[PDB]
Enzyme design. Structure first.
Site, PDB file in Angstrom:
ATOM      1  N   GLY A  91      -5.097 -26.921 -15.726  1.00  0.00           N
ATOM      2  CA  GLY A  91      -4.587 -28.249 -15.995  1.00  0.00           C
ATOM      3  C   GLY A  91      -5.612 -29.271 -16.431  1.00  0.00           C
ATOM      4  O   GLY A  91      -5.411 -30.464 -16.174  1.00  0.00           O
TER       5      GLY A  91
ATOM      6  N   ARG B 159      -3.926 -18.911 -11.737  1.00  0.00           N
ATOM      7  CA  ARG B 159      -4.228 -20.155 -12.434  1.00  0.00           C
ATOM      8  C   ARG B 159      -3.038 -21.106 -12.390  1.00  0.00           C
ATOM      9  O   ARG B 159      -3.209 -22.320 -12.229  1.00  0.00           O
ATOM     10  CB  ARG B 159      -4.635 -19.860 -13.877  1.00  0.00           C
ATOM     11  CG  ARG B 159      -5.794 -18.882 -14.008  1.00  0.00           C
ATOM     12  CD  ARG B 159      -7.058 -19.426 -13.362  1.00  0.00           C
ATOM     13  NE  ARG B 159      -7.637 -20.526 -14.122  1.00  0.00           N
ATOM     14  CZ  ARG B 159      -8.566 -20.382 -15.057  1.00  0.00           C
ATOM     15  NH1 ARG B 159      -9.042 -19.190 -15.380  1.00  0.00           N
ATOM     16  NH2 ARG B 159      -9.028 -21.458 -15.687  1.00  0.00           N
TER      17      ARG B 159
ATOM     18  N   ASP C 199       3.687 -14.460 -21.019  1.00  0.00           N
ATOM     19  CA  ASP C 199       2.811 -14.288 -22.166  1.00  0.00           C
ATOM     20  C   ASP C 199       3.108 -15.347 -23.219  1.00  0.00           C
ATOM     21  O   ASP C 199       4.268 -15.664 -23.498  1.00  0.00           O
ATOM     22  CB  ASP C 199       2.980 -12.892 -22.762  1.00  0.00           C
ATOM     23  CG  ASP C 199       1.984 -12.606 -23.867  1.00  0.00           C
ATOM     24  OD1 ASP C 199       0.991 -13.356 -23.986  1.00  0.00           O
ATOM     25  OD2 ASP C 199       2.196 -11.637 -24.624  1.00  0.00           O
TER      26      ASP C 199
ATOM     27  N   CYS D 218     -13.138 -23.362 -25.883  1.00  0.00           N
ATOM     28  CA  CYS D 218     -14.394 -23.767 -25.251  1.00  0.00           C
ATOM     29  C   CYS D 218     -15.452 -22.686 -25.473  1.00  0.00           C
ATOM     30  O   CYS D 218     -15.809 -21.912 -24.582  1.00  0.00           O
ATOM     31  CB  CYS D 218     -14.175 -24.047 -23.769  1.00  0.00           C
ATOM     32  SG  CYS D 218     -15.655 -24.582 -22.877  1.00  0.00           S
TER      33      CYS D 218
END
Ligand SMILES: C[S@@+](CC[C@H](N)C(=O)[O-])C[C@H]1O[C@@H](n2cnc3c(N)ncnc32)[C@H](O)[C@@H]1O
Ligand SMILES: [K+]
Ligand SMILES: [K+]
Ligand SMILES: [Mg+2]
Ligand SMILES: [Mg+2]
Ligand SMILES: [Mg+2]
Ligand SMILES: [Mg+2]
Ligand SMILES: [Mg+2]
Ligand SMILES: [Mg+2]
Ligand SMILES: [Mg+2]
Ligand SMILES: [Mg+2]
Ligand SMILES: [Mg+2]
Ligand SMILES: [Mg+2]
Ligand SMILES: [Mg+2]
Lengths: 95, 54, 346, 55, 140
Positions: free
Chosen positions: C148, C172, C200, C273
RNA sequence: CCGAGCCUGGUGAUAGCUGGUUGUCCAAGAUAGAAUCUUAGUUCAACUUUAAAUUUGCCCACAGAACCCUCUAAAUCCCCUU
RNA sequence: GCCUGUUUACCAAAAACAUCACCUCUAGCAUCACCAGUAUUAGAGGCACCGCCUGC
RNA sequence: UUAAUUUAUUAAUGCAAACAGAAACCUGCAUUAAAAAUUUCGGUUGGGGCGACCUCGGAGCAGAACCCAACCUCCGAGCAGUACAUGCUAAGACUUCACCAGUCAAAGCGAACACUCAAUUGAUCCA
């Protein structure tokens, strides 16, 4: 278990049984519940209620503890104001 | 002496206890009331943003 | 029967050392002389930005942060839009320190409302939300939303009536629910406004076609910041070598599914990232060709050069990126690494 | 496995010595609950005194 | 006995040659004043993490310099990737900069010749490194 | 018969391992598991044996045991009579 | 492998060990070793004579 | 040997002691090393590797009471939140094929007018 001592030649008593168990003269063995003082904050009141109870060992466990203790612990005692005095004899028992 | 001191201490604390409960209950409502005012104030500040849009 | 008497055994490297070696070879050629500067910032602890929770006493928190000399770069950037002359997602307040400042924000304290006053997150992770150009009344779909970092930012804007937060890992997802519960008041999450699921992302390209106008896709990738420091669940260990090999493939598939999910005329921002160009630009180019060849779908990538100049003061940008925008870490500005690319569907 | 909550011990304000343990969030003020005290057989105020551990 | 422990630590714990010890004491008189624990920590930092052998330490006047400046310069170079710790065999991928270059030369010259970074960046690293050092002491 | 001489003593060292375990006759008598530095073992249960007490046991007529689920399965569980 | 020499008595005599030569390390001194000696000495090691060789 | 457990022993310092008037020897207690001493080398799975796995829960096999295995076929759990009578007691039952643990619970007392969650857990001794 020492069946014959090296200095008296007689059966010994396992002190682990004596400290952790109580034997009534009727033959029943009274024990505590494993874990009645462990992590009480994560246990429900119903679960804690049966943890602080005194329970009886079954036939196999009782026969095991009768061999690990001598006859001094199977004698009838007459302690004054004994909390478990009334439980030393069975009533209305058949077979 | 130990029993009487404990009994007197219990009686003394229970004497102030109903007043303490009322004060504690009153503070809990006030703390929520202050937050409720902030919730309204947040809407008022957000109303300013709506003014900017218009 | 197994053979345990091998003549030569590969020496055991720590997962941190394994990650460092792979990054050293690949990123030295890609960045040239900037790699040593980047490498120190990666090994140093990243600076944490304080994202003000709008649901809480945001005005009072802002005054509190100003005492710690924190400066709202978002507010400064908003005034820079006209100075340089889709805009950006509004109603976001994130406070950081000056360039080269090492001061850390104190841990967040719950307010009178019972919610945390602010959220600490990387300032470079807020840019994809801002680059998304969120508008009120839209329906926002987020893939890999957990834990989040960007999911919370969307709700702070208040421009999303319906949200679809999907992460494959339930662990998660469980973290995402607690973060939303602690920060976002239950009234918003009470209804179907926030939908948190664990499936998914490839399914979203078929189950919900053209449903959402704004889709934010942050596919899983080799996290340079986490790999060089964390020793748990590192992608660079030998057991997970297979996942790393198939990692670019999943990045292409998940991005393509999100592109199918968005409505034509909508905006999709691809976020990652990592500093590896083989997973930042090639994945973007892979999805564009995949749609045209298989489903005959055409997309247009918007220019973030205008967006780049606004945050040049508080962020370091790499000016040799083909399609997306890459924010490289620096010693003065430790935010990053972050790669975000905005594409719209036509 | 960050310790989000901690285990604290609530001591009765009635002086009876009754106490019980409760779980509360770390980032929060000390609790002041209204729990039942078996010694006086009525609900009495309780106040947190000492933290036992971190959960 | 304060002098006795210092030389014995060098000869036994640091395993410096008696000839090398004579050159060290003449060159660097600060060894005697320095605490045994910090002196031992300073030496083993060069031997293991840096990879410097006994003869190079004596010739390069390693012990005279402060421990803190060694930590700041070595770690920053190590994190830059310019300095590679020698492996088990002793080989290195990229030849390391000369030890005299890192220490003898001034900070401004140190950044220009080897680090090739701006002055402001190194200032931030020292404050960041000191925080890590401060946390390291508290944790231990 | 030296990766630690030989001899004596502790010593009838210990071995979950190998081998052996001596007259006659009759009777009952086989394959669920759990834990274990445990799968070459042991403990408990199941099974098996003897003695004792007691009354039901087995077989089984209807009735009865789920929906999201038509491999709409073979068949069980329960179960008075017999 | 410098060489003579040495080793697995009872399956390996060798490219292995030792070896002059060279190198490193340690030690400023008496009365059972070193030694009735004293830095050109003694001890602990590496390499295996001799001869030749750059960059900087 | 950077496995674990130790410094008895040896050596070097420190202090106490003991002295002279300063010191040494010796002894006790410490701290450093040195040199040694004791003991162990978890299972599961994997012939061309640079490991995975060990506890708990759901679905398929196991189609209809229960139970039923892998190298199996798939997904997870080592929490959080709301309570603050999440108090005290007590018939009768379930029970993961034993045990240990685990689960439900009428009535009663006392108050109000057996919390959600498939898993979300660790015995004894000891402190
Ligand atoms: C690098 S994290 C990004 C976290 C988040 N998007 C943020 O920026 O704050 C990528 C996440 O994607 C999730 N993920 C991995 N594979 C996925 C998949 N196939 N479908 C959906 N989510 C997936 C993983 O759980 C992982 O936590
Ligand atoms: K065995
Ligand atoms: K011979
Ligand atoms: Mg012989
Ligand atoms: Mg024997
Ligand atoms: Mg027969
Ligand atoms: Mg065990
Ligand atoms: Mg020869
Ligand atoms: Mg010759
Ligand atoms: Mg021979
Ligand atoms: Mg021969
Ligand atoms: Mg030779
Ligand atoms: Mg012994
Ligand atoms: Mg049972």
């Amino acid at each position: 278990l020492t069946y014959f001592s090296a200095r008296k030649g007689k059966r010994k008593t396992v002190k682990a049984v004596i400290d952790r168990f109580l034997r009534l003269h009727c033959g029943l063995w009274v024990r505590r519940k494993a874990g009645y003082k462990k992590k009480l904050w994560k246990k429900t009141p119903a679960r804690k209620k049966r943890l602080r109870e005194f329970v009886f060992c079954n036939k196999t466990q009782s026969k095991l503890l009768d061999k690990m203790t001598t006859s001094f612990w199977k004698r009838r005692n007459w302690y004054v104001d004994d909390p478990y005095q009334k439980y030393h004899d069975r009533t209305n028992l058949k077979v | 002496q130990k029993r009487r001191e404990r009994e007197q201490h219990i009686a003394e604390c229970m004497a102030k206890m109903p007043q303490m409960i009322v004060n504690w209950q009153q503070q809990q409502r006030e703390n929520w009331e202050k937050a409720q005012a902030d919730k309204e104030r947040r809407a008022r500040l957000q109303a300013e943003a709506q003014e900017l849009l218009g | 029967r197994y053979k345990k008497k091998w003549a030569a055994t590969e020496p055991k490297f720590p997962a941190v050392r394994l990650a460092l070696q792979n990054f050293d070879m690949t990123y030295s050629v890609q960045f040239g002389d900037l790699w040593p500067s980047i490498r120190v910032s990666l090994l140093s602890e990243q600076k944490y930005g304080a994202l003000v929770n709008n649901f809480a006493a945001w005005d009072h928190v802002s005054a509190k942060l100003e005492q710690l000399s924190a400066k709202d770069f978002v507010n400064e950037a908003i005034s820079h839009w006209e100075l340089q002359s889709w805009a950006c997602s509004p109603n976001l307040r994130c406070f950081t320190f000056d360039r080269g400042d090492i001061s850390r924000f104190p841990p967040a304290r719950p307010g009178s409302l019972g919610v945390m006053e602010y959220y600490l997150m990387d300032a470079a992770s807020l840019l994809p939300v801002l680059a998304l150009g969120l508008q009120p009344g839209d329906i926002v779909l987020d893939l890999c939303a957990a834990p989040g970092g960007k999911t919370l930012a969307l709700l702070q804007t208040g421009c999303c009536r319906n949200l679809a937060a999907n992460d494959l890992s339930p662990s998660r997802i469980a973290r995402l629910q607690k973060i939303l519960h602690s920060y976002v008041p239950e009234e918003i999450r009470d209804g179907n406004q926030v939908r948190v699921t664990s499936w998914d992302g490839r399914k979203w390209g078929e189950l919900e076609g053209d449903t959402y106008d704004r889709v934010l896709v942050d596919v899983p990738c080799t996290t340079d910041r986490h790999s060089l420091h964390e020793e748990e669940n590192n992608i660079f260990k030998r057991s997970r070598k297979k996942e790393r090999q198939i990692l670019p493939v999943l990045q292409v598939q998940l991005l393509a599914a999100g592109l199918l999910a968005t409505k034509p005329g909508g905006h999709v921002v691809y976020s990652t990232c990592s500093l590896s160009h083989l997973q930042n630009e090639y994945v973007v180019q892979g999805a564009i060709e995949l749609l045209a060849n298989q489903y005959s779908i055409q997309v247009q990538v918007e220019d973030l050069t205008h967006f780049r100049r606004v945050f040049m003061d508080t962020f370091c940008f790499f000016s040799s990126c083909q399609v997306g925008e890459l924010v490289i870490p620096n010693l003065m500005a430790n935010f990053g690494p972050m790669y975000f690319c905005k594409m719209r569907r036509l | 496995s960050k310790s989000k909550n901690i285990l604290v011990r609530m001591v009765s304000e009635a002086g009876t010595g009754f106490c019980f343990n409760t779980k509360r969030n770390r980032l929060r003020e000390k609790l002041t609950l209204l729990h039942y005290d078996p010694v006086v057989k009525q609900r009495v105020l309780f106040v947190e005194k000492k933290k036992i551990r971190s959960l | 006995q304060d002098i006795n422990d210092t030389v014995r630590l060098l000869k036994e714990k640091c395993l410096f040659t008696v000839q090398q010890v004579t050159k060290i004491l003449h060159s660097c008189p600060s060894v005697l004043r320095e605490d045994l624990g910090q002196l031992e920590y300073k030496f083993q930092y060069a031997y293991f993490r840096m990879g410097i052998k006994h003869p190079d330490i004596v010739k390069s006047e390693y012990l005279q310099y402060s421990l803190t400046k060694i930590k700041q310069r070595h770690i920053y170079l190590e994190r830059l990737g310019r300095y590679q710790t020698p492996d088990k065999k002793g080989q290195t991928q990229i030849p390391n900069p000369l030890l005299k270059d890192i220490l003898r030369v001034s900070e401004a010259e140190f950044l220009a010749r080897t680090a090739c970074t701006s002055v402001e960046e190194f200032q931030v690293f020292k404050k960041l490194l000191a925080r890590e050092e401060e946390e390291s002491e508290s944790s231990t």
